[PDB]
């Protein structure tokens, strides 16, 4: 398993809330 | 398992809330 | 397990709240 | 002549160019 | 002549260029 | 001539360029 996540040139504003993650990677992921 | 997360040129403003993580990586991840 | 998280050129302002982590990595991660 | 210009809650981003004025008021105005 | 210009809660980012004025008021104004 | 310019709660970032004025007021103004 190979994960390559690249982000370039991002503009985030007024994102009031519960922002968990911009980029996420794992072997196993579960949201309840 | 290989994880490569790169971020370049980011502008975050007025993100009032509960920002957990910009970049996240793990073997196992669970959100309840 | 290899984790490589790089961040370059970041501008964060007015992020009043409960900012936990910009970059996170672990073997196991759970949020309740 | 009465001018009342109010602005509340504004979000301006990536406005690269020649932004002259957000709010303008005058007796006389000419653009060549 | 009365001019009342109020601004509240403004978020300006990445406005690279030749930003002249946010709020402008005059008796006479000409742009060549 | 009365001019009342008020600004409250401003967030300006990454405004690289030739920012002339945030708030401007005059009797006469000309741009060549």
UniProtKB/Swiss-Prot annotation, chains A, B, C, D, E, F:
List locations, semicolon-separated.
Secreted
- UniProt tissue specificity: Synthesized in mammary gland and secreted in milk.
Report the PTM annotation. Answer: Alternate disulfide bonds occur in equal amounts in all variants examined.
Quaternary structure (record): Under physiological conditions beta-lactoglobulin exists as an equilibrium mixture of monomeric and dimeric forms. Interaction with LMBR1L which mediates the endocytosis of LGB has been observed in PubMed:17991420, but not in PubMed:23964685.
Functional description taken from the UniProt entry = Primary component of whey, it binds retinol and is probably involved in the transport of that molecule.
Give the family per the record. Belongs to the calycin superfamily. Lipocalin family.
For this entry, the protein name equals: Beta-lactoglobulin
What organism is recorded for this protein? Bos taurus
Lineage, opening ranks: Eukaryota, Metazoa, Chordata, Craniata, Vertebrata
Q: What gene codes for this chain? A: LGB
